[PDB]
Amino acid sequence: PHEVFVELNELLLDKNQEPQWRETARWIKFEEDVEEETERWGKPHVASLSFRSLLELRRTLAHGAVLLDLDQQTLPGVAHQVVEQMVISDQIKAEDRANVLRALLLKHSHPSDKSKHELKLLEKIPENAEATVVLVGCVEFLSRPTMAFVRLREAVELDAVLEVPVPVRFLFLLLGPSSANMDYHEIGRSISTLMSDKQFHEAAYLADEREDLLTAINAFLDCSVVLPPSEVQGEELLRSVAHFQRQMLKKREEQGRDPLRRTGRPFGGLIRDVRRRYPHYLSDFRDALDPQCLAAVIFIYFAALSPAITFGGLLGEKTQDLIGVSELIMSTALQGVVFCLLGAQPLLVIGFSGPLLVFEEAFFSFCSSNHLEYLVGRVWIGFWLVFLALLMVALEGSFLVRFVSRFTQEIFAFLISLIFIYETFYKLVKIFQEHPLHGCPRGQPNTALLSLVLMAGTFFIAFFLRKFKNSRFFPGRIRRVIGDFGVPIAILIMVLVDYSIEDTYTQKLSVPSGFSVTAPEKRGWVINPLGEKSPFPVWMMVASLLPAILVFILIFMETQITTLIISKKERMLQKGSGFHLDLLLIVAMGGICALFGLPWLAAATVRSVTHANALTVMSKAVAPGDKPKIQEVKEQRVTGLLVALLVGLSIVIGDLLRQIPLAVLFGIFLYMGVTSLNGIQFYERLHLLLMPPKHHPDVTYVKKVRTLRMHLFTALQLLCLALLWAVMSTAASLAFPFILILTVPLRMVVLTRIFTDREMKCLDAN
């Protein structure tokens, strides 16, 4: 039981007709060949071998010389024993001993003739592996081909046969005349592909006699596929060539023979989470002393600051400056420090979200249309939120996230993107009416077109940098670093361009100077739950439960979905999960912060995923040609605390934030809206509605389902989304969380009634 590294050496004249042994190929997991006219290693590929070479090898292996459990530790002795066994096996006469022995002892040469190559290659080779050398060559002083196979008792590192220091266990000799129409390079390639797979080398390990090696090659042959002699193009191999192998292998092997659970005790989930996460406390403050940790704070800081200022600008221009940039910054800083010191999943980034923005819009519209204070109703909403969070934590109910499937999540994401796009286009439509494009802040000449130019420029700069991040240019290290700084670069470039122009007027941000409210003449710092100016009605202190339930539904959905996605198993997350503590902390802080007139926050799934990806380390000991794998994720609660502190210390520099026009922020808004459409399995199904059935891909939800049924599924999803969008534009746009809550069981019951069970496993895969 070991791992094998195989290398093929051939007898080829180097420069001055000296014989020389030259390396030609190398097998770790996949074959790599050396180009003859360039002398450099090619790309890895599947070792495809002919069938005549296999028969020639099988024919010649029967008459070969076999030596088992040899006791030599140097090439002299091994070669002498091999020659003696050859001459006593009636393969060569007693006159060719000297010439064959001379041919055996020569100088091996390699293309990369411990330097950098050995250090780099020893990483990709497994930790403790044993090596094989295949020596094949054409000899003009022989009559018939001769073969020898040896297995050493103890692994021995030979002097220079191999390019790297790996102990050698197996040797293969094949010398013969150029006649008999035999291709020795192909036979060597066949032997090296034989010795580089698990079954054959395991069978060769406990091999006692000659014919035990013929059974192994017979078993190798009845496990492979055969391709007929005809092909034209390259998309014909993307088909079953990879599916046929898996199906046949599964047939061979088949014929060859939690943090989400109701306990029953009150607050059981809290106790389990606290006793699972908190013991490993001092570790989270120690694994932060790494270069990667301090290189992730900057990008996370920018990615958390840009949406904060954008959403603050939109809220300030919409909420009559009751809540603006300063208040969002204070809420993000205050609630990002407490969570990262007490929460059980410090990889979540707490911030504002689109659904919360549209709910605030709807509640403001409700309050204005009925002449009620907007900041004293939020206090009672927060109180009821605190009560609701306590009650569901008390009776474990976080298992309800298991009932939310892809069907609802994709509708949610699509609606969020649509409202972002609508907001951006509404803003520019409104710009062109304040400043009409007539002849020679109500009549400025060059404002509307310059706003359009800024918005388009900041979009098109971030688009072609997200594109560049995914490309193949530059070193991979630097490409990843530069491609990680797209939005700040676009914002800085557009701000500099706008600052160069010193004649035209454009709207700017409204951040104030020092620790102050955005509207000091309107509100103070604490909102008394009895009425700022007029007394609050006594019938709304009780009837504020419904908006509390709706906002709780929104917060629960986003936070629990984020915690589900982050805690997947493919990501090596080992410390634990916070399904019950995170929700309690988030909702309690959201309820308390409403007393001071600050907004509610959520989990911010995309930012959390970005933060999780910037702390992963990829294993470098991966053989060429296989995909990279996650080594581990560095979990700690220092980077989140630092980001929360840094976001808070952005009011003291509010002088540099007043030079930023609103058009740049709305361009970044639209860029975030369009880019989020990727990754949801509803956008491509909607793309499939316009292509002919010949061009549909080979994804799992296409091969198993007829076209019309898939189109029916997509039509039902579109109908649900359109019904959700109709309610939002009316004067009763305080029920869309209820509409999603309705589309959950509607989905279950009705779509179970219509579609079969087999179809709802590919169209609605978990």
Add this chain to the structure above:
Amino acid sequence: PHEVFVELNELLLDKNQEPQWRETARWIKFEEDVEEETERWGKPHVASLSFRSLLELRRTLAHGAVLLDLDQQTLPGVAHQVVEQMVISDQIKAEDRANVLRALLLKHSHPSDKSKHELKLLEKIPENAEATVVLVGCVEFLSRPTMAFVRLREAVELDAVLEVPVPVRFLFLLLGPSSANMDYHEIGRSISTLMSDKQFHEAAYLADEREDLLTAINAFLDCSVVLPPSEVQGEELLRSVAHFQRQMLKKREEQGRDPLRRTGRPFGGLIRDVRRRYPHYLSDFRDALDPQCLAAVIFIYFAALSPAITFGGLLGEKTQDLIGVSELIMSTALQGVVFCLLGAQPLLVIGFSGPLLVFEEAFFSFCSSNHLEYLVGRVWIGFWLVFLALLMVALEGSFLVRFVSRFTQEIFAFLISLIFIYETFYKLVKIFQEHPLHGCPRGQPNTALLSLVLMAGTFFIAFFLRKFKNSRFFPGRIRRVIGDFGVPIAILIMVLVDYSIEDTYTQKLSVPSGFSVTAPEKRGWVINPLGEKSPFPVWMMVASLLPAILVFILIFMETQITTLIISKKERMLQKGSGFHLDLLLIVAMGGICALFGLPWLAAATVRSVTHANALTVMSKAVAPGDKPKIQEVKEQRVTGLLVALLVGLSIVIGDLLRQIPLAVLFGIFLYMGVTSLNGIQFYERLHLLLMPPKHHPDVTYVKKVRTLRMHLFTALQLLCLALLWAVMSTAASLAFPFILILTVPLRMVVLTRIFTDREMKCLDAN
């Protein structure tokens, strides 16, 4: 020597528990399988077959009944005879005759249940072919598997076994007990893949016993590849399989055993061209009575109108309206009509080109700096061009185009694109400098920004609609039709948008009313070749030979490169070629029209290729999984004559052409400049300087040459291009065609002594 069609029928069970034979796969060139749970044909692929099935088939064929030269034309009779010689071959007992006979006579069912699909499959199948039927099934009332093979004396159309009315020659029968360590579907696929290649089905006709079949299957086996049981991705199948089969097949077959020609008689090429092309004159006018010609006429009209008006706008804004849109249109119409009536290659579209524009502006700069008349020098330049064209055709010097390699052509194309981009950006900067963006046809408030908006909008629409032409949306017929009209659609949309705005001033075109010169104050219609206001110097008439050689070099290069590219063997052009006649006509009529103050024209390679691609017919009788091939090209001289007439009649709609701003034209200019950078290997190798060696493609100029030598080649090309640009930037820009043609001796002498012969065959491939 014939073609074969194979269909696999498997004995299954339906919902009614009656057996029936059900079609499962189909072989024309590549396999297509029927999905079980969807009942539709999958995509074609290579028939990958396992190795155990081949051994099982060979083992079974060792004892079986062979029915050679059967003489019956019904399925009952052949079934009865097959059973009769099965029961006498000691394969099945005499008690199972009735059961096997009952099994054979059943009902065949296919998924496609004449018809439209029947007609389509008739088209896809070759003209005259024979059918093979493979009937494999598991039967519960036999002891051992049984196989029979027949060959009918005469091809017979069986009743309903085939989905297609194709005569049947062979049929295979294989019935055996269930669960006998055999996969009968896989054996059926093995037999059907055996029967669907040239060698096996060619050797099946000349068969006498089972020994011939065994020899044929042995010869089939040592021509295939074997894939070991290992794979992770699909990028690794691209390397081994396609490149390895070609090498093996070439080894098997290797070990298995003009218009450009000097004559000597003056005007020989003219005589040859006239005697070759002119006899097929009546066929050039009766071939236009096809539906595809009219759509081609419309498309080429829209493709040839826009560059004419754009170049006319640039020339008018640069030549002080001495030459404008009207003169461009008149010259284009006259030269097009004359060439289409008299030329030997009427697939060329004669029009203005970028290098001609550069030479015209350089000559204008030369004339202004010497206080000379710009319209009297052109008369003498044309007078010398006529004599130069006559002398070179008289000596048959048109073979000199054989010495122009990819080096010079790629340098030329890159320079043209660079000048287009520079022109567009210079005009944008000039527009911004004319109308600044200060506060409240010179000094207009919001003219500078509207021009930028219009130019960017038209460029982006033109780019994105060309992107959609290459996509996979809509029916292919409609996608091709819609995607041909990108530039007219962009121009129309931007013109409508600009027409909507009715308060801002933008520059427009300068089309005049009626057949008139653009500036009827300095020139008439006939230029006096003696001086209009002052006598022309005598020394300038003689010394006009120097500028008359550079323009000749430019015209010759463009026209002959276009005629070379068009007349390749891939495009099925059968009428002839016009190397020595089209050049004479073009240069003579360019020299003549210089007397009336009209510009010279050229061959317009891209427009000619577009006109050639719009008249070709794709073969529809091609097997699935095969690349389409050209059936023929409709060669006629009505399409070009109509386009030339239509372009000339664009003067009468000059009222509509005055509503078009210049920004839209400059956006189309920049789009044409950027989009031409494709197909140039210099651009591709310039991309590879920024890409790590790991990511370089598998093209022929990468695998066979080291990276540094490839980089040295690109550096030398860049140095030549930079030298040409620096020369054109100074006041000696009149002599850039001299330096452009000086890279032929450089390649022939200097680049030969640096790079070996092997390297200058993939880097400089013809």
